[PDB]
Structure formats: C-alpha cells, structure tokens
Amino acid sequence: DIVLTQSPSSLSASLGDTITITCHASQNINVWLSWYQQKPGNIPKLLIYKASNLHTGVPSRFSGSGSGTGFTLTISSLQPEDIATYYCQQGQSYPLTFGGGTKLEIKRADAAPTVSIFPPSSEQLTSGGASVVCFLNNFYPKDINVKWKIDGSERQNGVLNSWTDQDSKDSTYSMSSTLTLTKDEYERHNSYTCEATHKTSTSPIVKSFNRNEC
Amino acid sequence: DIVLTQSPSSLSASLGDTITITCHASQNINVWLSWYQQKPGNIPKLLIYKASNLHTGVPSRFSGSGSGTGFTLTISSLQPEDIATYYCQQGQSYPLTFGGGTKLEIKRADAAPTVSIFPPSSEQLTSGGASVVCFLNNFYPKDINVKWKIDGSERQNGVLNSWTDQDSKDSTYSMSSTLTLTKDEYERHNSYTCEATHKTSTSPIVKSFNRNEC
Amino acid sequence: EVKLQESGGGLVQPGGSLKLSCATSGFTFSDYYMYWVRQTPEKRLEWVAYISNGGGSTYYPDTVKGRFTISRDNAKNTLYLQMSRLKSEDTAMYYCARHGGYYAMDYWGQGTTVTVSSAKTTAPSVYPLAPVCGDTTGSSVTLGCLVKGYFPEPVTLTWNSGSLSSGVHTFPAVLQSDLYTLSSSVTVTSSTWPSQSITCNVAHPASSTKVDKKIEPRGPTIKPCPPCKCPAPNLLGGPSVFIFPPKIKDVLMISLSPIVTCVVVDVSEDDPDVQISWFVNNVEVHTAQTQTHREDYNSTLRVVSALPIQHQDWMSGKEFKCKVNNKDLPAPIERTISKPKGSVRAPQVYVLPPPEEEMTKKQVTLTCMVTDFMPEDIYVEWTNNGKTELNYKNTEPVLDSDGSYFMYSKLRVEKKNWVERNSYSCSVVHEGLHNHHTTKSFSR
Amino acid sequence: EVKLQESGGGLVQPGGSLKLSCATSGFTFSDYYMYWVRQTPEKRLEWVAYISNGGGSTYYPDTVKGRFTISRDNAKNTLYLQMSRLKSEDTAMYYCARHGGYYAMDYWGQGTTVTVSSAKTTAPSVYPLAPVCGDTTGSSVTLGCLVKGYFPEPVTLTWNSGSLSSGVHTFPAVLQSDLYTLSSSVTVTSSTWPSQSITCNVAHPASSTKVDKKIEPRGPTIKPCPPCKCPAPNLLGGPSVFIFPPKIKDVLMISLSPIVTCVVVDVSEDDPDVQISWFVNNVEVHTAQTQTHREDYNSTLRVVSALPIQHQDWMSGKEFKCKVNNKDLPAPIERTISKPKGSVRAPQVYVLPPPEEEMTKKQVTLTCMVTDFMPEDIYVEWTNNGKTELNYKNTEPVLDSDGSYFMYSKLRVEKKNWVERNSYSCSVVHEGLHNHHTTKSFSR
C-alpha cells in the first residue's frame, strides 16, 4: 500500500489568514491527489483533484499544488465555512488510501469557562448510584484541566470527561466531567469539589457543594 | 390618744455613716419609748426600750437616747444588715401608738440592670391570654423607667411592674414589668420590646423578641 | 426558744366574724400580758388590744372597740382574738405580741393574713417562664415563673421545693381588678440548666393548691408531627378482661356442651353490674343465653360471662368477641378468641405394658404413648370396663423433632387386676381422629 | 439532482452479515465506476471497494477481500455491498461514492452506520440535573440532564420538545464498558425557569424509549409524621430482673461448674452501666468472679450477671441475692434464690421397649419411665455406647398422685439398630440417687 502522511494533525489560525496543509506519500503518485473537506457533521465534498484542479464551487481561495510525493493544499482568507477536516488521497494505485486528516480550528480571544456542579438526582440515588456532574461551558482555548476533590481536597481518578467541537457561533468549547460513585460511597463523605485550571485565570476556578443539605 | 411623728419618712445614706432618726410625741411620755426594726418581708424586732435600754441580741451600734418629748435612734456605722424600716412606739399611756416609720437605703455604686424578656408560655396561650414578662434585675439607683413597644416602636399602657426592697447582700433593686394581652391581640403583632432607661447607660438598654419562631 | 405561732387568717365578707389563735410555747404564759397588733398592707402598724395575765382587764383602741375582744386560755398557752363586725379597713396582718415588761413588745409571732373582701377565693395559675427560643446562651441563664389570678394574699413560691435560694427574686404580688399576680425570677448559673430539674413550687392556702411547674426548654418549632388524630381515651387501668377457649373435649364431642368464657376482673362496690356483649363474627348474638355470674374474693369482684357455643361454630374458626362496658371505662374493652388454622395429623396411640422388672411390687404401671399428632390440643383418659378410670396422670404435650407432638398417660394399678385381665383402655379424643375418638385397648 | 442515498444496515453482532444498498439518482448511473468508502468512529477514512462500469471487474482492499462483495444493478440504479463474516474492525460509517474523474470521489451518499458488537441493546436512564440546593441565584441558571447507560448510539436529546434550543449543549456520548453516557447542559436567561417549566426529552430507537424528565428544583431533605400507634399517656415499666438456679447437673457433678444467673431486661441504651451487686447469704461477694456483660436486642439491652458458686454452697441451703441499681430506679430491685428445702426420693427408673405393633416402620420408639421422685429437679438423657445420644425428647416432670414426680424420655431410632442390639441407655442424675447417678438399659 502507499500510505499518505497529512501534516499537521490540527491547526488554528485567525480569519483571513493563509494556511498550508500538506501530504506526503511513500511511493510516487505523480499527480493523482485529491483533497476533501468534511465540515463537522455534513459529508465530505470534493475540493481538488489532479493535485491542482479545483472542483466546481471551490472559491478561488483554495489552492492545491505539488507533484510526485509531496502535495499541499492552501487556503487564503479563511472564510468561516472552511472549518472542517481535510483529507488528501492518492489515486495512483490500488488500494485507494487517504491521509489521516487535518482538522481546522479558528483562533479567538480567550474566554472564561462558566462552571457548574450538579449533585446526583434523588431519582438516581433511589436507583443505587451517584453521579456528580460538572459543566465547564463556553471557553477557549481547549486546554483546560479539571480535577474532582471529595472531602477537604482529596483527588480522584474514576471520572468520565467529554468536550465538544469548537462551537460555530461562539467559537468556544464546552466540557462535561462526571464523577460516578455508589450511593453508599457517595454517602460516606460530605464535600465535593470540581476544580478547574485554565489560562484565563491564575487562581483555579472552583465550585463546591456540601451534601449536608441536599 | 398620744401621737408620734417620725422624721424623715425616708433615708438613704452611705454605708458607714451615722444616722440620727427622730420620733416625737404630742404629750410628755417620760422615757417610755421603744424602737423596733422591720427588715422587709420580716416581723419587727425589738431594738431598744424605755428610751435607751438595749434589748438582748441587739448590737452596740444602735443607740437610743433622748427623753421627755423627742427621742433619737442612732446607728453608728451603717451596714447591709441594717436595710430596714425603723419604727418608734411609745408606752406611757394606752393605746400604744407608733410612728410612721423610716425606710432605709444604702447609697452604693451604680449598677447596670440585667434585663430579660419572656414570651408567653404555651401553657398560658392554651388558656387564652398572653403575658410578656421582663425582668430588670440587680440595679441601683431605684430610679429606672421601662416601657413596652409592640411592632416597630409603639408604646403601650396595660403594664404591671413590681419593685423589690433594697436587697440585703448586693444592696441592689429588682423589677418585674409585665404586659398582659389576649392571645388574639398578642398574635396580631410580631415584635415585642422591653426598653429600659437608667443612669448607668446613656443609650436605653433594650431586649426584644419576635414571635415569628416561638 | 420562745415562739408565737398565729393561726386562723383568711378571707371574710364584710360584717363577718373571725377568730384568731396565737399558740404560744416557750415560757410561762400566765406571767405576761399579751397583745395583738396589726399592720396594714400599707405598712402602718396599729395596736389592737391588751389583756392582763388573768384576763380581767382589757383595753382596745376606738377603731375596734366592741367588735374585737381578746381572750386567753392560760390552761393551753394560747391567746385569741374574736372579731365580729369586720370592715375592709380591718384588713391587715395580725401579730400577737408578748409584753416585755417595760411597755414594749419584746417578742412577736409570725403573723397571720386577714383579708376582708366580698370577692370570692380564686385558685391561681402557674406558668413556667422558660427563656427565649432564641437560646441566649452565656452564663446568667435567668428563668422565672408567673403566678397569675389568685385571691387572696398570700402564696408561697419556692424553687426546688426550697433548696434553690440563691439568685432568686420574688416580686411583691400586685392586684388588678379582684385578682393578684406575682412573678419570681431565678437568675441561676450557666452550668447546664437542663441538667438539674428546676421546678417552680407554688402553694395557696385559701384554696389548698400546691402546684409544681417544671420549667422545660422552649424548643425549636416545626420538626416532628402532632398527635396522629388520636381520639378520646380508648384505655385505662381498672377492670381487666380475659377470654377462654372451650376445652378440646367439649367441642369435639357432640354430647358435651362447649362454652366460651369471658372473665372481667378488678372491680369494687362503687361500680356494680357491668355491660356484656357477645358477637359471633360481629353478628348480634344479643346475650345468647349468656349466663353471667358475679363472685366474691380478695377484696374485689369478678364477673364471669359464659356463652354456650355451637360445636361446628368454633370448629369453623369463627370469631367470638366479648365486649365489656361500664361507666369508669373511657372506651369499651373487647377481646376475641378463635380456633387457629393448623395442620392436622392423627395421633398414633399405643399402650405399653408395665416393664417385666416390676412384676413384684403390689402396683404396676400402665403407659399410654401418644405420638405424631397435630394440633397440640388433645384429651386422653384411661377407662376400665366403660367407667372413667381414676389414678392416671397425663404429661403435657411436647413438641417432637418433626413438628408433631407426643405425650404419655401413666396409669397405676394393683397387680392383681393386671394379671387377672381387666378392660383397661387408653381413650384419646383429637380432632384428627375417626369420630374424634379412638380408644386402643390391651391384651394380656 | 445527482444524489446518492445508501441505506440499510443497523446493528449486528460479530460473524454476522448485512446487505448495504446505495440508491443513485440524477445521472446515467450505467456509465460510472462506483466506490464504497467507510469512515470509522475515530474519523479515519478507508476505501472499502470499487466496481467496474458493468460489473465483472471489482476490487477490494486486502482487509475486506473475501468478506465483501460489491455489486450493482444498472436498472434500479443501485450500488450494493455484501458484507459477510463481520469483524469488529468493520464498525464504521458507510458511504457509496461516484468516480467523477481521475480516481476521485466527486459525489458521496449520506452514509449509514454499522456497528458490529456482541453486546445486548440496553435502554437508557435519564436524570434531571437541577442546580445545587444552595440556590446559586444570579442570571445564568444553567441546568442539565444525564443520560446514562444505553446501547447503541444514538439517542435524541431535546429540551422542551425542541421549543428551547438557545443556550443548549449536548456532549458526545462516551463508551463506558459496553454502555454509553451522554449529558446535555442548558443555560437560561431571565426570571423564567422556576415559573415556566423545562423538561429533558430523550429517545432511543433500538429500544423505543421516549422519556421526558421534568427538571424540578432541588428541595430540602425532610419528611413529616412517623408513628400513629397513639402516643397515649403510656410509658415503659423500666428494667426488670430475674434470677435462675444452676442446672441440677452442674451442682451434682463434681467436675462441672454451677453458677447463679441474674438477668436484667429493658435496659435503656442510654444508661447501659447498671450496678449489679451480688450477695451470698447476705454477705457481699464483691466480685467473687461475678462475670457480667451486656447483649443488644429487639431494640433494647439485656445485662447478664453470672456468679460462680461452690457446689456445696447451693446444697447447704445458702441464699443467693442479686441487687441491681441504676439512676432511673426509684429504689434498688433485689432478687433471691435458694435450694427449696423438702423431702427427697430416689426415682424408680425403667426402660420400656417399643410396642410390638410398631415393629414394622423404619423408626421405633424407646421409652424411659421415671417415677416416684422428689424434688422436681432432675436431668435425664439417653446414651449409646458412651456418647450422649441425639434425638430423644423429655417430658416436663408431672406431679403424681402421691406427691412424687414422674416423667418420660422418648428416643426414636432406626429399627436396624434395635434388633441388631445396641447400647442404648437411659441415664438419670438426681440428688436422691446413690452417687447421684443411675443407668438403666435393656438386658438383651
């Protein structure tokens, strides 16, 4: 097989910027390289074939190039509807292989995550389990680290995290960290804390709740 | 009948001082005159008889003197044990008549009244009435004015306060002021305040309670 | 010591008489002139009367001349004062006072309170004044108790029946429209108030009222639940009721007459006849020939109600109720008995001969063994040629390993009758038996 | 115009098969070469297959070679994929694409998920995440709902049926050991939530589960009204004391160790330290090895005091007293025990063999008869070749006619052991016997 190597794996840049994605191939593929665009959710649409040949629609700002083993795609004046994942694919021989992908991220001013802690639901307790959920909404950059603390300031490891893709409108991210215990084990302690560390603030953003009431 | 006049009708003097209380008659009674000493809440005790002959048990401090028509009881170095009312009875002729008496108070250092409000007892409520009691304990001088205030600062008139005689040991006074309302009229109000004014403090000593709990 | 205890104080309508006694005891009464002096509630003292050792010379002030007469009974040491036309002015504390010699009272008694008023005597009401719910903690946990609405003076208010005397204050009771009110405040020490039971003790003479209100903490409102709609009293301590099942034999046998008894104990002559009510499964069997005897014993009376039952009735686990009622009962007490549902097994009855190593003594021992039966209720007897044999004893039934019951019935007999051959038979009657009765016999 | 609508394929377990159809419209389908491409959940792209203009020439990457079969019917305008002998690896999104040029996919279909798994379908559980009880009021009242434990993807979570879509966030479900978890957070603005409701709407296809959890505000932990058995002017008597004699076996047996027990019931859990004082003959045996210790129970505490005794002490008619005290006791409760003084008769002990009319069943009944003995107190057991036999039951002692007592001990045994002859013996122990121990058996 001829494995393609798209680089980098993800990129962030401001609007209007000109950015270059690249692909490399083990064996020579002459000029048989396509470039696809997959905006989060929607299907991939063909952007460029025969290395430079632009497909219908593709506004001039997209430019393919290269030959032999290295090819590059280049977007000028990043227009919002570019945010997607790009993949190159050789078409010299069988099997047809793609080159991993390169995901696009827009750059924006930093923003402070709105956190919120949620004690298990009485409905869940009745069931026999306890899940404390913490929502670190609307923020940027993606880099953030959260850590749970039971009584006092004791950290835990049995968590389940999940972030979303960069939001269309806000350009921000969101995350939902969930600690899942057993009723009993949840009952042995009193305080629960969701501690968040993030570029925006020096002092860790913390939201805590005491089981002493609810 | 032989009439006896005592002067003064009241006396307040600093512990250690010397008292010269008098007693006068309308006619010549030779030396037939007694001096009894009634401490509050107690039966008279014979102190001196036939002008100056001391009774048994009676301390050398007290000394009667005078004869004819005007006698004089004299307490050398006043002391707490001497807070009492002092009478001078005669016995020349019948009936044996006494004088008005003489109250005695000890001018001691001023003292701050310890106040205390008491909401009606549930036991009383059940009955159909409400008495809010306020205790203005251990204080001096006797001059003090208390006033009740219902909601906000509205004064009332259905008050019943009571006073104690100068206490033996602490030389202080005590008072019990009580407002007595109907269950109904007590309920159609919320805040109750016992306000005390007294030489010891410039700002009125106040203790209040809100029926919103008990 | 010398003592003068006055007595006979109280309240009297205007125009009524009163006789005060002044029991003296500590000297030679007959050697002194006695006096009576009263002191108004306003505190002025007034000389009331004089009487010579003998009692033949009296003197009174104009204010009481005629209405009062002082007298003495040297034979009993007591002085006296009889008042006939009392006025409200005559209200005061009366003190009998011994004469010292020099025209002055050297000794005075405790005094007795006398109030002349048209008003009626009224028992007071005591109220424990616990401090504010907003627990004002500190050190000086002052408390108090209100004594309101009493007539006439005075009352005796004490804490801990007398012990607690420090920091206490009692206020000169005052009156508002024919009623007195008095309060006392004990400024007790922090320590832990709810540790030693602090009780407000108040007594009123004229009404013989001794009340002790324990001062309990004003706790936080709204936490538990009020009485769960509990009605008027449905029980008490007095007559007792017990119910009894008929004996296994009476019911299981057609002929015999089953009876259900209900006995009521603990009652006296003040509460005679008592109500009885029988109901089979609540059905109104209105005194169905229920004979009810009344016996006599230790000092009480015991009623015994007997209701003849229908054999099959009991057998069908029907309910038999007994409802007893009487005036002293806050609510009627009714018991209930019935036959418990239970597995049944037929008794394997055997008769064992006296052991060979006993054929020497004059008497021998016949043994009747009953095993594997259910329920436990049974009746076994021994019989000889028809007649119910005497001299047999029955063990109580015991629960064997397999949930069933067993039991023995021993019969002692004179060896002669044994070897000569006689009709000795064990006869058992159990519900789980052919006609409720089997009767295994012997051989030789 | 040109549009590709592949469809079919849901969920299937490993080793299974599935047929993927691709609908083409808008072009002379009969003139193009078609591709089947799959994108795994990781978002990576893989070329599944290619087909010639009129079939015949087909190609499949090594991976799928042998398992897949791409095909077409140039009539219904449909491209197909015949997937067989499935492996986990094949789990991915599948799209059919058209070759509109020189080796390039110009048009793709919508796509169809296919997950191969040996897991069973599980309906989810929804939980309303109301905010913290400590009502963090402000403006941004964010809420949320957890959807836990469901399989497989996906589920549709919508707030208020769709009416609310401004300020919502839905988090990509995560695979926690064969089961999924997803949460969604919504953020409201303006004093509108407590008043106007909000519900979490979640639906799961594979299990046909539509649940709507209304998000109700967090309310405090407290509920009213526990007992209804009428807190009548009732109470508890207080602790009770009982005393027990040593077993006649311990006392008559030198080796054994007799003890006198005193048990105190109804001990308040808040005052477990009761003072148990013992007294042999009115002389204190402070300690004397009194072994006390408590036991918890039905809801109360029971103290058990054991005082070891010397055999003879009991027999010599001594009197053991037990005096218990505690704060709630108005006056100390005492109890005394002593060996009842009376006559003494050795028991006549015989053993009866099972009745002849029972030598059929597999079990037989040995009977031990004990008669004419005083006092009540006795102890009988059965033994076999030395070892204490099991399966024997004893009647309680009964008072015979002549003031003496009798009682039996039944023993059940397997007939085999009986006829083959075995050492079954009735062993009695009673004070009136020489050496306090007799042993009767069957001369067989």
Ligand SMILES: *[C@@H]1O[C@H](CO[C@H]2O[C@@H](C)[C@@H](O)[C@@H](O)[C@@H]2O)[C@@H](O[C@H]2O[C@H](CO)[C@@H](O[C@@H]3O[C@H](CO[C@H]4O[C@H](CO)[C@@H](O)[C@H](O)[C@@H]4O[C@@H]4O[C@H](CO)[C@@H](O[C@@H]5O[C@H](CO)[C@H](O)[C@H](O)[C@H]5O)[C@H](O)[C@H]4NC(C)=O)[C@@H](O)[C@H](O[C@H]4O[C@H](CO)[C@@H](O)[C@H](O)[C@@H]4O[C@@H]4O[C@H](CO)[C@@H](O)[C@H](O)[C@H]4NC(C)=O)[C@@H]3O)[C@H](O)[C@H]2NC(C)=O)[C@H](O)[C@H]1NC(C)=O
């Ligand atoms: C004033 O004096 C009296 C009498 O004086 C005696 O004093 C003592 C000190 C001695 O000197 C003695 O010689 C004196 O006679 C005295 O006693 C009375 O008070 C006590 C209570 O303190 C009371 O005790 C109860 O007795 C229940 C049994 O009653 C029968 O048995 C006793 C003896 O045990 C006997 O004395 C009674 O006479 C009575 O006997 C009945 O009599 C009837 C008569 O009609 C017969 O009726 C049958 O019914 C029909 C027709 O009538 C059939 O066809 C038959 O033909 C017919 O015969 C009965 O057969 C006959 N039976 C017997 C056996 O003779 C007893 O049950 C009860 O015990 C229960 O309750 C206590 C709590 O109180 C519990 O601790 C017990 O454990 C038990 O509890 C029950 O348990 C069962 C299961 O086992 C449960 O199912 C129940 O739910 C459960 N609860 C209850 C509530 O039952 C208790 O022991 C005596 O009976 C009284 N005796 C008399 C004569 O009045 C007083 O104390 C004294 N008072 C004072 C202040 O000084």
Ligand SMILES: *[C@@H]1O[C@H](CO[C@H]2O[C@@H](C)[C@@H](O)[C@@H](O)[C@@H]2O)[C@@H](O[C@H]2O[C@H](CO)[C@@H](O[C@@H]3O[C@H](CO[C@H]4O[C@H](CO)[C@@H](O)[C@H](O)[C@@H]4O[C@@H]4O[C@H](CO)[C@@H](O[C@@H]5O[C@H](CO)[C@H](O)[C@H](O)[C@H]5O)[C@H](O)[C@H]4NC(C)=O)[C@@H](O)[C@H](O[C@H]4O[C@H](CO)[C@@H](O)[C@H](O)[C@@H]4O[C@@H]4O[C@H](CO)[C@@H](O)[C@H](O)[C@H]4NC(C)=O)[C@@H]3O)[C@H](O)[C@H]2NC(C)=O)[C@H](O)[C@H]1NC(C)=O
């Ligand atoms: C919380 O629950 C408890 C218990 O829970 C049970 O409750 C019952 C109701 C059921 O629901 C059951 O399912 C639950 O599990 C409850 O009960 C307690 O209180 C009651 C009274 O309220 C009390 O009753 C007394 O019981 C006496 C009998 O006690 C013995 O036997 C019973 C079983 O029959 C057993 O449970 C006891 O534990 C005890 O057993 C003794 O234990 C001793 C050691 O303690 C052994 O001794 C051995 O001997 C030597 C050395 O001593 C060996 O070497 C060993 O080393 C040594 O251990 C004994 O062998 C063992 N016996 C047996 C047979 O195994 C009962 O006698 C007593 O009756 C008196 O009162 C009634 C009237 O009320 C009278 O009619 C009686 O006559 C008697 O009164 C006395 O009578 C004699 C003559 O008979 C007179 O001479 C006396 O003067 C006279 N008065 C006195 C003061 O003596 C009574 O019935 C329960 O036993 C308690 N439960 C327990 C487990 O102890 C609680 O009340 C409940 N809480 C509340 C608030 O309700």
